[PDB]
Amino acid sequence: AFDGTWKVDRNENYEKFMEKMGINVVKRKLGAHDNLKLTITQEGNKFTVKESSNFRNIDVVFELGVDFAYSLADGTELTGTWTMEGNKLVGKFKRVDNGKELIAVREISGNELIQTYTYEGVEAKRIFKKE
Numbered sequence: 614a615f616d617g618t619w620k621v622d623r624n625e626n627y628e629k630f631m632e633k634m635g636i637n638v639v640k641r642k643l644g645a646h647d648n649l650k651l652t653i654t655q656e657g658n659k660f661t662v663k664e665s666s667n668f669r670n671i672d673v674v675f676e677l678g679v680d681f682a683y684s685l686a687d688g689t690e691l692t693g694t695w696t697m698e699g700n701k702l703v704g705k706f707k708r709v710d711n712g713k714e715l716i717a718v719r720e721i722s723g724n725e726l727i728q729t730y731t732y733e734g735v736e737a738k739r740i741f742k743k744e
């Protein structure tokens with residue numbers, strides 16, 4: 614369902630979310646203008662995500678329900694899993710530093726991939742368009 618190449622289109626509440634994550638002024642400004650492009654490839658229960666942005670070009674591989682580690686562009690480490698719940702991909706992660714939970718949702722909406730993030734009562738969204 615998620616295969617393809619998606620480029621960020623719009624953001625809602627994103628700088629606010631980053632602030633709450635405690636990310637510094639500069640990195641927040643840069644983060645908000647990262648030109649994030651995701652190429653997603655699903656092969657059974659295995660997904661490979663090519664994360665391409667102004668920060669880095671990283672390949673992320675994970676299997677549904679198997680815990681993995683991921684580091685954010687500013688170096689903060691998370692551990693968690695992605696699971697399929699019906700048509701959405703639900704990501705439940707914990708910050709390695711303070712043990713607080715980060716929930717991420719990926720859902721498609723005809724031509725658009727919406728990624729919604731929640732942390733400590735703050736919700737933000739990133740919207741991507743199919744290439």
Ligand SMILES: CCCCCCCCCCCCCCCC(=O)O
Nearest residue numbers: 640644662673683685686687704717
């Ligand atoms: C400079 C820091 C940027 C701020 C980043 C905001 C938080 C993004 C959280 C993404 C968590 C899930 C990503 C896991 C990898 C994947 O499945 O694509």
